[PDB]
């Protein structure tokens with residue numbers, strides 16, 4: 001309980017910024033997460049022995065895929081940490097606990113394939129969950145690990161508080177289904193502009209937390225250009241492997257997933273920034289002003305893809 005985690009000076013400082021990269025040393029990522037939990041929540045919120053044991057099982061249950069891996073989990077969790085720390089007073093004690101956990105667990109047991117692929121393959125998970133297939137699986141794996149011996153990090157919550165926190169985690173993980181994001185953001189944009197947005201309405205908080213989840217999930221686009229550029233390589237390696245699996249089912253994949261259409265990548269990045277990424281950080285910034293650095297970093301990267309097209313790189 002008198003056992004603060006501490007990081008080297010460069011990490012102690014840069015971990016507080018939205019555009020932090022956690023680095024290539026896998027063995028520090030557990031310590032980085034615990035440091036964030038302790039600074040975001042308290043040294044008191046979790047039992048150190050139980051939390052370490054949870055983190056290491058969560059890591060074990062992520063797979064060796066190019067993008068949707070353990071590094072993605074910890075990266076998404078760091079962006080949540082930076083939102084929460086810039087928005088000190090806005091969030092309950094349960095929310096601070098639930099959200100860093102949700103982010104670490106949001107892609108548990110990802111195989112590097114989209115909901116679409118699972119449905120077209122006729123994967124058993126598509127029979128068990130007609131919508132948000134993989135996200136209901138990720139939540140399912142999160143509960144499973146919570147139920148392992150010595151892994152209930154929520155042990156000191158009441159039956160009531162426990163059920164609220166698992167319900168935060170559940171909604172937070174479903175919201176990472178990007179198909180759900182577009183309507184979530186429209187509704188939020190309308191609520192904000194007709195001035196009906198009320199963070200005391202649980203049903204409003206839910207939508208705000210879903211947007212935070214999309215934002216943290218998409219956060220490769222809020223990094224400095226060299227991180228953004230090299231992360232895009234991992235994203236497309238997964239997309240093209242799926243395209244290959246689509247071609248084996250006898251289905252032309254969408255060009256995003258077709259590795260024969262590598263040339264179209266920069267124009268695709270533009271659409272993505274324009275249709276998804278910018279709207280997302282803009283609406284988030286309107287609701288939570290201190291998140292403006294994510295919007296700014298995204299605008300910077302849109303500008304770098306526009307220079308890729310004009311062949312200035």
Ligand SMILES: CCNc1nc(N)nc2[nH]cc(-c3cccc(C(F)(F)F)c3)c12
Pocket residue numbers: 178218220221232235256268269272276
């Ligand atoms: C276009 C390039 N995509 C992406 N590019 C980057 N940099 N980050 C990303 N994270 C998720 C996607 C993604 C996943 C599924 C569907 C789509 C959509 F374009 F349909 F919205 C997008 C994505």
Ligand SMILES: [Mg+2]
Pocket residue numbers: 106107176177
């Ligand atoms: Mg996911």
Ligand SMILES: [Zn+2]
Pocket residue numbers: 072076106107176217
């Ligand atoms: Zn994710």
